[PDB]
Design a protein around this ligand. Structure first.
Ligand SMILES: [Zn+2]
Lengths: 38, 50, 137, 360, 136, 96, 227
RNA sequence: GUGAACAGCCUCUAGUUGAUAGAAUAAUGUAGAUAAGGGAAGUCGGCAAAAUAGAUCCGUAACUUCGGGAUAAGGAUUGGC
RNA sequence: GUGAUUUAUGGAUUAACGAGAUUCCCACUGUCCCUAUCUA
RNA sequence: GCGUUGGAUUGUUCACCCACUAAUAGGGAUACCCUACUGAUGAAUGUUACCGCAAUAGUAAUUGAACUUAGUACGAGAGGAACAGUUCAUUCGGAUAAUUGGUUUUUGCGGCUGUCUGAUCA
RNA sequence: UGUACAACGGGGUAUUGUAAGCAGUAGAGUAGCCUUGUUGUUACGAUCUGCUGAGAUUAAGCCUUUGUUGUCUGAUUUGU
């Protein structure tokens, strides 16, 4: 595919990207419940 | 030149080759769609008939 | 391809648009458009300018530094083109921009909260300083 | 030196109709089924395209290269009637027309010229002639089955299905390149009040001919008309006159795409994976949207935007490799041409700008 | 076009008429050129023969070593100072006009180069590609 | 669009850069060599009297003395305090 | 040893590149030079149709060894991806950011040691030793500053342009650690990096390369089983 | 007011609002302008257009009937609080 | 007669000046490659 | 059938060089007024409209270079085309505004000097 | 007398480049009522910082419209 709406993927592409996605999944799991997005 | 006999017949044998066969298969390929369009509109007409 | 950004604006120069100017010091300045091109010819300073992005990310508007911003730096190490990582990166990049939108909307809110209090204070200045329209109505 | 002009298109006058009229067709082949020889739609704007290149031997083999295309609105096209034509020692002769028992308001509005004051009585006797039996119709049809070595069909567009508002339908005649003229008219009779795609005539990896009328430019004199220098009478002495609005014919036109209205993400290559139709930001420039099929062809057709064109399927069996190469798109620019466009989608606009004062 | 020029040239914009001064990017110490001529010329009335990147000229040296001055020798253009279009989609330009000296065959006169050369001339002339320190 | 743009800011009259002058200030040896540039007859100031900050060759000492107490030198010496704006922040300001 | 002709040019190492574990080739014209290489070597190692920013010149815009490989800023993600997909993952691949890009012009390298410009940056000078494990030196040859153009190296031997004096020859043979010869290729073509290419078990040269030239390179690179 | 000014620009006192009008923007003309890249190659011919031009600091050769040439050349500077 | 100066169809010379005549150097630029646009 | 150049030199055509390209062959032939040429409407054909035919007239494409064949046969070698397959390019013509660059009364948006409406604003 | 047509308005695109109105413990500085500071505070003060990618413009030969408000029967000529 090599392309998205923007910021084409070869600057994104590495392994452990799902691990990073979980590393941010926990972060949004923190901030969703704190009322920060009021 | 465009219109020299040598380049011309040398192009005619090649036209008799791969290109006309590609076109002869292309016309059957597109005749398939050209005929099934009638079927699509006719099943729409069946949805009208019911 | 690349969507390589404007040297002067950090704005995306899609393929076909703009200019790649290349100096005696053998460095490309790929440009979004003529406006930014003529300004760079004119030796303007975007950090001083207000419509650009270097100034914005320097000036305490939307955060320059974060991991959601920094996930996409570069890769000078190719990765052998497996399919199954890409099958998930397509969702990763999708959700990253959603969370980034949420974060920067929250940052705009962090910049623009306390606006209604000063709005009411200026309107209170108005109603206290002009009670004559209140005699009228 | 050369002559500061051509001589072929010498009576440089305006044409008589904006419909550039088909004059040539490739002859026939009476072994195939019927294939329509032409089609027609309305030019809308231009875009830019990059394309990975399977051209064996060329300098740009297996490379990305940017090129430039046009786009035309190509709705489905309904058939309304036929005509026959017979060889004489004068030329050809229209000997019968036959129509298709129910006609749209659009074509009834074409044949009339001041619509709303009209009683719109266009075919009210013809539909009455379409009796319980269609006797006179079959009379004047099997005649053509006997005679009429070559046969054409009438078409009209569905122009209400375009962003454009003219309300009027552009007739034409179209030649066939099948055999068995009885089968031709039988096919067409079944196709009466039935409509036809553009992916059912054309496909990718194709060459076409584009015949249209140019943009007008008024009465420009010699220096910009012929590109001649600046400080009895012969007809080639580069005298001023009307430019533009001539008919022309442009050939060897490589299609890249045969679009589809129902297909969402018409701008999608295999590469982008973005749900965007090719209608870019801002709408087209003096044309609207593309919610129908379409064509993406390289070069630049004669015309201006929101102008009609007619299409022909290259009129002979081409010989160049470029007539047979295999196309593969990599990316459609989808930016607004109402300015130096930067952004494909308004969601990308939101993403790169952020939220704003009017946003909340 | 001449000998040595492997591959064909694709059409580019044309910036350099005759009488157009340019830099000498060589390591001989020669400093400038003054074009008089082009090889691969078009034929038309009242024209100025144009040169561009990848092209090969005959020209003088107006400033450089005196042994080479008041003498004519060939040259290749290396920097255009005018905007062109590589098909892999981008417009670009270098700032300055520059041309280096070389024999009629295509072999480079000097042994080294200062500054950037265009992708076109680099791809075209292998001895440029061997003696050049830079690409773009 | 006009005459001032083309009479000051064409591609024949360009300055050296903002960046290389910053790196020249950082590097000790560079200002030494730039001051010890020898004579050349092909300049009016004859290959000397070069201001490092304002990259121009004056012809005498008074054109340095009056130039240093001026509003043009203020510009360069104020801009050379902060960051020299290389391509890094241009990359950085949109998530690169 | 074999002479070989690119399309009508005798200079090979401007249009192609070699290592002990793989080989590169441009895609200019027709697929005959790749067949020419595989006629000698075969499927012992990968031979790869490759490009650099759509350019034909890989032989002078690239530098590497059997341990690792380097490419300049101008190259593209597509070419980098294709290089890793084509080549085994045993060898490194890496894209470099510099002011100047003429890597094969300015790197004459073999698997253990390589030479570079004096003004090359110390960042990439560290990185090349990091990726290849090779000792780096920043020198010239007879004042001729392009090192990757006028030198061709191997672990068997090497070569330099003929104008080098003998003091330069010996003091460079010290640094380079193989026997050297101030030699020629194609009737005195000064550009030896492009005029010929060499690895520990093959050399390739233009058709104009003569029999004395073949003999001296054959001896110095010790290529047959009787040298 | 401006600024050296009785140059030019704007304004108050005072006086005209007269010059056949209207609708349309096709060329070419007439006056006025801008144009990349090169920079007099064009042309009999630097014809015309265009370049610096104002004020201060330094500085200004040969030649001379010593009186000048000289706004010589040429470099820097010019806002507001 | 002749036209300042040094030294009489008048001889060698000459600073300044001339809407006096000729060649060339700088920059300048649509004179030109190559023409394009806009305004009353 | 299609093409035949850029410069250098004289009021002068006489005279004769440099370099490119495939070549840079020789010759001839005030003006609104009526005509010719370039373009534009137009009643009459019982009407008005749509689609088409095509008597006739004009006619445009050109050249070089290159991968392969092929370092082929031939030649002792130096040297070396070829036919076919394939790609580019030149000069000409016709279109087009995606993109780039040029253009500004969008007088759209800012900014500026002097001045006028007391000052800001506009 | 409608899949209607238009005049405005909204939305989309783009254009420029961050408005009037204020507020500040930024603001070289000079005076200043004297609570004689030890950021004394008060005066002026080019500008800077924030409400502000803000403001204005947008078809006259751009896109889009379930909004509002109006128009929707004037003259003439024609026959085998
Ligand atoms: Zn920008």
């Amino acid at each position: 595919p090599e392309i998205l709406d923007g910021k084409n993927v070869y600057d994104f592409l590495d392994p452990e990207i799902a691990a990073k996605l979980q590393a941010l999944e926990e972060e949004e799991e923190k901030l969703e419940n704190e009322g920060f997005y009021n | 030149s465009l219109r020299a006999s040598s380049h011309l017949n040398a192009k005619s044998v090649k036209r008799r080759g791969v290109f006309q066969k590609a076109v002869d298969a292309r016309e059957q390929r597109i005749s398939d769609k050209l005929k099934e369009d009638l079927l699509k509109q006719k099943l729409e007409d069946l949805k009208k008939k019911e | 391809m690349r969507i390589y950004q404007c040297h002067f604006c950090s704005s995306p120069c899609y393929p076909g648009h703009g200019i790649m100017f290349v100096r005696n010091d053998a460095k490309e300045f790929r440009f979004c458009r003529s406006k930014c091109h003529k300004a760079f010819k004119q030796r303007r300073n975007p950090r001083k300018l207000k419509w650009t992005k270097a100034f914005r990310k320097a000036a305490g508007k939307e955060l320059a530094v974060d991991s959601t911003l920094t996930f996409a730096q570069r890769r000078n190490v190719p990765v052998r083109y497996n399919r199954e990582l890409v099958a998930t990166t397509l969702k990763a990049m999708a959700r990253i921009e959603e969370i980034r939108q949420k974060r920067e909307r929250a940052f705009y809110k962090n910049r623009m909260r306390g606006n209604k209090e000063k709005d009411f204070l200026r309107d209170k200045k108005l109603v206290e300083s002009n009670p004559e329209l209140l005699r009228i109505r | 030196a050369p002559r500061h002009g051509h001589l072929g298109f010498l009576p440089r006058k305006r044409a008589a109709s904006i419909r550039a009229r088909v004059k040539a067709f490739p002859k026939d082949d009476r072994s195939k089924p019927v294939a329509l020889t032409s089609f027609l739609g309305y030019k809308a704007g231009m875009t830019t395209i990059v394309r990975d290149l399977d051209r064996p031997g060329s300098k740009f083999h297996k490379r990305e290269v940017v090129e430039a295309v046009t786009v035309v609105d190509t709705p489905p096209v309904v058939v309304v009637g036929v005509v026959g034509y017979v060889e004489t020692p004068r030329g050809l002769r229209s000997l019968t027309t036959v129509w298709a028992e129910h006609l749209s308001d659009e074509v009834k509005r074409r044949f009339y010229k001041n619509w709303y004051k009209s009683k719109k009585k266009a075919f009210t006797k013809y539909s009455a002639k379409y009796a319980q039996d269609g006797a006179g119709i079959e009379r004047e049809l099997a005649r053509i089955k006997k005679y009429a070595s070559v046969v054409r069909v009438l078409v009209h567009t569905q122009i209400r299905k375009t962003p454009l508002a003219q309300k009027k339908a552009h007739l034409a005649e179209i030649q066939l390149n099948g055999g068995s003229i009885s089968e031709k008219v039988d096919w067409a009779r079944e196709h009466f009040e039935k409509t036809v795609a553009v992916d059912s005539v054309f496909e990718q990896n194709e060459m076409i001919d584009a015949i249209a009328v140019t943009k007008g430019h008024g009465f420009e004199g010699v220096t910009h008309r012929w590109g001649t220098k600046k400080l009895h009478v012969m007809w080639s002495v580069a005298r001023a006159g009307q430019r533009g609005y001539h008919s022309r014919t442009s050939i060897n036109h490589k299609i890249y795409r045969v679009g589809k209205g129902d297909d969402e993400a018409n701008g999608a290559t295999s590469f982008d994976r973005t749900k965007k139709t090719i209608t870019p930001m801002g709408g087209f420039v003096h044309y609207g949207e593309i919610k129908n099929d379409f064509i993406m062809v390289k070069g630049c057709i004669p015309g201006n935007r929101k102008r009609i064109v007619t299409l022909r399927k290259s009129l002979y069996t081409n010989t160049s490799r470029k007539a047979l190469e295999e196309v593969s798109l990599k990316w459609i620019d989808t930016a607004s041409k109402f300015g130096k466009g930067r952004f494909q989608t308004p969601a990308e606009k939101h993403a790169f700008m952020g939220t704003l004062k009017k946003d909340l | 076009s001449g000998n040595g020029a492997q591959g064909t040239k694709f059409r580019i914009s044309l910036g350099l008429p005759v009488g157009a001064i340019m830099n000498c990017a060589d390591n001989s110490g020669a400093r400038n050129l003054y074009i008089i001529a082009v090889k691969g010329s078009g034929s038309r009335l009242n024209r100025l023969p144009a040169a561009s990147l990848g092209d090969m000229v005959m020209a003088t040296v107006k400033k450089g070593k005196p042994e080479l001055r008041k003498k004519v020798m060939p040259a290749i253009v290396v920097r255009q100072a005018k905007s062109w279009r590589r098909r892999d989609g981008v417009f670009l330009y270098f700032e300055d006009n520059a041309g280096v000296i070389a024999n009629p065959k295509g072999e480079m006169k000097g042994s080294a180069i200062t500054g950037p050369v265009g992708k076109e001339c680099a791809d075209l002339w292998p001895r440029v590609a061997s003696n050049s320190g830079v690409v773009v | 669009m006009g005459r001032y743009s083309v009479k000051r800011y064409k591609t024949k009259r360009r300055t050296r850069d903002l960046d290389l002058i910053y790196n020249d200030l950082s590097t000790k040896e560079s200002v030494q060599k730039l001051l010890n540039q020898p004579l050349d007859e092909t300049k009016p100031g004859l290959g000397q009297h070069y201001c490092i900050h304002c990259a121009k060759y004056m012809e005498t000492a008074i054109a340095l003395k009056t130039h240093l107490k001026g509003k043009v030198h203020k510009r360069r010496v104020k801009e050379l305090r902060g960051v020299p704006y290389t391509q890094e922040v241009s990359d950085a300001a949109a998530g690169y | 040893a074999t002479r070989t002709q690119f399309e009508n040019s005798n200079e090979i190492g401007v249009f192609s590149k070699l290592t002990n574990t793989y080989c590169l080739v441009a895609v200019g014209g027709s697929e005959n030079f790749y067949s020419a290489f595989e006629a000698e070597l075969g499927d012992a190692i990968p031979i790869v149709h490759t490009t650099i920013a759509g350019t034909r010149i890989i032989g002078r815009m690239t530098a590497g060894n059997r341990r690792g490989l380097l490419v300049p800023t101008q190259t593209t993600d597509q070419e980098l991806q294709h290089l890793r997909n084509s080549l085994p993952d045993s060898v490194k691949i890496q894209r470099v950011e510099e002011r100047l890009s003429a890597l094969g012009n300015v790197i004459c390298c073999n698997d253990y040691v390589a030479l570079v410009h004096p003004d090359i940056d110390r960042e990439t000078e560290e990185l090349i030793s990091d990726v290849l494990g090779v000792e780096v030196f920043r020198q010239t040859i007879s004042g001729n500053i392009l090192v990757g153009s006028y030198c061709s190296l191997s672990n068997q031997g090497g070569l330099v342009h003929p104008q080098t004096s003998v003091q330069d020859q010996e003091e460079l043979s010290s640094l380079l650690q193989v026997p050297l010869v101030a030699g020629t290729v194609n009737r005195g073509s000064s550009v030896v990096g492009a005029g010929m290419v060499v690895n520990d078990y093959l050399a390739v040269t233009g058709l104009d390369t003569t029999a004395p030239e073949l003999s001296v390179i054959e001896s110095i690179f010790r290529l047959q089983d009787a040298q």
